[PDB]
Amino acid sequence: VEWSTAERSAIAGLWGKISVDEIGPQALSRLLIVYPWTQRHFAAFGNLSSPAAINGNPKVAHHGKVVMGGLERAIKNMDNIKAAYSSLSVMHSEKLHVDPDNFRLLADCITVCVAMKFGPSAFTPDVQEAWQKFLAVVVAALSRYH
């Protein structure tokens, strides 16, 4: 995949401002609230019985951080993302059988929480553009390797 130097720096400035401790738990909570079938993949977690329980759940939070850590791994390897994710792909394909449409749903909830935090002046169309190309590489790479 080719990045523009505009993309590269857009991605890097945005990631640079993300508080992983904040967005992570928030994005995972929003997926389990907005797409609650997704709770069945995490029923080792608690206590997903209501929005409140989701937001107070330490494993949800921890795991939202761990998701941002998957993203940070794609950040540092932007030219070879597919390879960085190869184990992740196997674990989400061959082991969890997470239907791929879900990775799209999480990426969308991530975007939503980024947008909400940065507002119109920082979450620019051109920034969204490059963020989205990035998440589409990630999702692809998560996402069965044929």
């Binding site: 929003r30 947008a115 909400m116 169309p125 553009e129 989205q132």
Partner: protein
Amino acid sequence: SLSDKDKDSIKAFWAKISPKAEDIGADALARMLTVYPQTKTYFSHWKDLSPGSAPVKKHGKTVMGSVAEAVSKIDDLTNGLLTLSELHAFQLRVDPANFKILSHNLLVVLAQQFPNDFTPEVHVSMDKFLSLLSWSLSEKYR
């Protein structure tokens, strides 16, 4: 799909946002166009696809205008939307998959603008509103 809580929650939401409806329409539409450049193929007769351009501001205002009508007829979407559905299936023949894309850009812009007010619970209700909206837009395709 829409429950009495979705109705109240989206109606109340509409009243807050919506001074800014045209803003949202142009911010959501122009984002769809650059972020998802495959939706560009439908508007390539315009002048002017970029974020903020006049054709986007003008077409943004319309989209959000028919989403207002749709919210006033929220208990009978199935009626409010069927003519837009003949136009989208039959004269424009828009791939149904694209609707999901506009509606995502639209949740993005709400909420980028009203972070404030876009709890996960409001997000649920808005998102169900807009799948219903796509579902009614799909009525006339086959």
